[PDB]
Paper text:
The SisCsx1 monomers are curled around the two-fold axis to form a dimer, and three of these dimers oligomerize through their HEPN domains into an equilateral trimer, thus assembling into a hexamer. Each dimer contains a cOA4 binding site at the vertex of the triangular assembly, and a catalytic pocket located 70 Å away inside the triangular oligomer along the two-fold dimer axis. We show that cOA4 binding activates a cooperative sequential catalytic response in a hexameric SisCsx1 complex and that the RNase activity is switched-off by Ring nucleases, which cleave cOA423.
A SEC-MALLS analysis revealed that SisCsx1 is an oligomer of 300 kDa corresponding to a hexameric assembly. A cryoEM map of the complex at medium resolution was used as a model to solve the phase problem by molecular replacement in an apo SisCsx1 crystal belonging to the P21 space group. The SisCsx1 hexamer is built because of a split helical insertion (V365-N400) and the last helix at the C-terminus (D445-A454) in the HEPN domain. The α-helix spanning residues 375-391, establishes a series of contacts with the same segment in the adjacent monomer with the helices inversely oriented, and a well-conserved cysteine bridge (C361-C380) positions the hexamerization helix. The helices fit into each other and the central interaction surface is mainly hydrophobic. The hydrophobic interface is flanked by several polar interactions.
Author numbering:
A (entry chain D), B (entry chain C): 1 to 454
The structure:
Amino acid sequence: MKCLFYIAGDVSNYSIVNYELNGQTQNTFFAAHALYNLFKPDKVIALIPDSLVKDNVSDEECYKNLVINRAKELNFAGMEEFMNKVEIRKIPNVGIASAIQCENGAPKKEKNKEGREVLKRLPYNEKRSPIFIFNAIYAIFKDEACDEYLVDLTHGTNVLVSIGMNVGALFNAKFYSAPVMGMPGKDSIVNIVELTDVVQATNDSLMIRSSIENLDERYFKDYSAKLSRLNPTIFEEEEKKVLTRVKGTDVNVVINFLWNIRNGFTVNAVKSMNELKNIINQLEEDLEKLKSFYKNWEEHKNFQGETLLVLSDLDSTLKVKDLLIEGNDLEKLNYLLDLYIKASIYDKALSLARELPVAICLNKVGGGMFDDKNEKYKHCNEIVTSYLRLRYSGLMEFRNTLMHGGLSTDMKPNVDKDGNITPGKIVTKNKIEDFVKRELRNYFDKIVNFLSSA
Amino acid sequence: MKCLFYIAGDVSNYSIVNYELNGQTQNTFFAAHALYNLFKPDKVIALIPDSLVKDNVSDEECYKNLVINRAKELNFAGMEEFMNKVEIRKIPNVGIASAIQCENGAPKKEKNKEGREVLKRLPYNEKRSPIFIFNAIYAIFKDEACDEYLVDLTHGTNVLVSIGMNVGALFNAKFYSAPVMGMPGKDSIVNIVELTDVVQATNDSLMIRSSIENLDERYFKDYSAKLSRLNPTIFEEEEKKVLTRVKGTDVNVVINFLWNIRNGFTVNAVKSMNELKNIINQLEEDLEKLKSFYKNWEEHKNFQGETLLVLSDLDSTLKVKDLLIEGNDLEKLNYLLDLYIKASIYDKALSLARELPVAICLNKVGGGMFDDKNEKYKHCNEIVTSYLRLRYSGLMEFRNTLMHGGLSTDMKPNVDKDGNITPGKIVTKNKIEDFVKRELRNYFDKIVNFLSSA
């Protein structure tokens, strides 16, 4: 059960036009009607501000009559399923507006000495909060319990269409708008454009910039599906060069790189690092060409109407350059530790801060594998384990508490004879946080300090 | 270095008004000017669509002249120093628009048989994609490299203000718009509204809705700071009741509940669960009251200006009812395992799936502490460890592979005398993904089935 919302707006001076949205066309005089017939929602919500219509009992019924009083002035078709299958809900607006005056569900007409016009008593000055209007729009949206949504922004004030769009994004809502901008008389095909792709594409970039900042791959929205079907009809052989080098920027390598980081596979994360420097460098200068095309779009068409390829998806990916450091793999892990601390992922930070110091000696002792069989590891792990317990009683104690959690030999909870626990250990939280974010890198450095001269 | 952008718009018919934004007032004839004097940006960007101004050399030069040619008709003071501290950058628009025609950097004036006017040749009809306009505005915003941003939406088409707002959100921009909707003559104070809080309030809810779905607390934006200073001046002593139950809605316990889950303190997370069911009960039935207030906002205007308290922040918090199951703490963990799999965090899922069956025996065996001294644990852990290695060699095999990452006795990389790795135990993303998501719960249930009869 779909719903489709729109902003009301005064429609007494709109003309009959052919609105078109993706091949299908309809002949009405305002977008909501033309949009209604295209998608056939099970109900429709009108959302009429105070900027039009206020009488003494129920303003809502005057609006229903103003469209009927205008469907007469243009002798437009039946249109009666619309008026009898529409739920109208009044919403606030912000001051400087000028409001129509109705009387008892019919619009007040008055004399202008030349021709007959409607009585606008322009009394609308109201100082309202945007979050107040926002809260009011949210309440309408939640309490209709729809599935699909759909939203028309064609006909609202600059301030309301702004607030309405943000509410719609909370409901998997598709956005539609037809730029009226003047009266083209009867006919002159006006195009309705689908704003849904923009709203989706901006939340996509907030997740990505923060998926890199938090080292979490389940936030990186996978737009590789998009670049595959990225095919315009006619693009120049200069654009063919940069655009076909972007279709090939294999974003899978950066998702795999995060997944490997998130789950603790520091090896295939560090190993895979120098390969990303190739990918984001190619994407760095491939965006810079693309970034230059859209900068002076002037007569840079071909694109000029292509739905795929969003610069935001690319430029937000470039923040993954922050997770890349040039150098040798043992020092790449040393950087990866710091990444595990800026982002607040504590367990992996401790375990690497313990295991990396063993590898850094293995280098100093001429290399060896990480098995107990390998004697050079067996003995470096001893020095690390023993030096820790000598001066840094703290490090291992925390790491052991984060690896095995509550419900472990380490926390010692007390399962009672009835199915519920009585844990015997305070989760320390800030002592944990104060240690990892303020101490760990320093403890780690003093460990490697001692091991250098081996 | 601040910036302040605005949408251009036709200024030939704007009048002189008192723009007001937070006590301060400035006196100009279009909002973008008044905003500049208030915030003192280091530069200003014009952003001229094609919807106004088309001449033969530089469309950019006519707008700057069209603002001055209106700065004469109202003999407004400054403006000509302003006009050259404004860098004019041309942006696209979408069809049916009707454009002014300039000639040589001055607007073409014509004779209207009544009065002298500028020739609007209404030749603007364009089929552009919204993302195209978006990409071009993005290029403008990124390549200006500001610190603060600021954006005026007072003066743009509905389609541009939609697309423009989304660009601003990727640059931590504060949004401003003045509801024009008509000419209020000279004076009649027009108010600048700050749309910035709405945009923040909707991404804040996107992060909250996704913080619960992924069991990650560093996404939950904490609005409790807001509720502390949430106190209106005059609120009815019915609203005093419901609103005083919201300042006290202690959200700190739900963030702590997330942090405890992400880091593995499954005990004190589960222990704290039955306390949360009380909290979302109060916030659920307190949200329904608030939601009805904004449902009859028509005369409930003691909020008509309250900036704090966003419904989205509250209603999005309610999604945590999804992480709640009533019952005894042993079965609450049994649900917590499933949660560690819905959200794709495998290690905590595996490690809980191993230690929980040890607890589930202790109940059946009359309770005991989780320490090695306590023989009841000592012997239950033996049975599970032994039954696993008999029938489920896999569970522990992966669990041990996820707790300890690469750089461990379990993965066996080789660290060579030059500072490189070389992985040993190759386990792929999908072998892990397939095991936890498809098998673990079945392996886990059959363990408890066997242990039931103890």
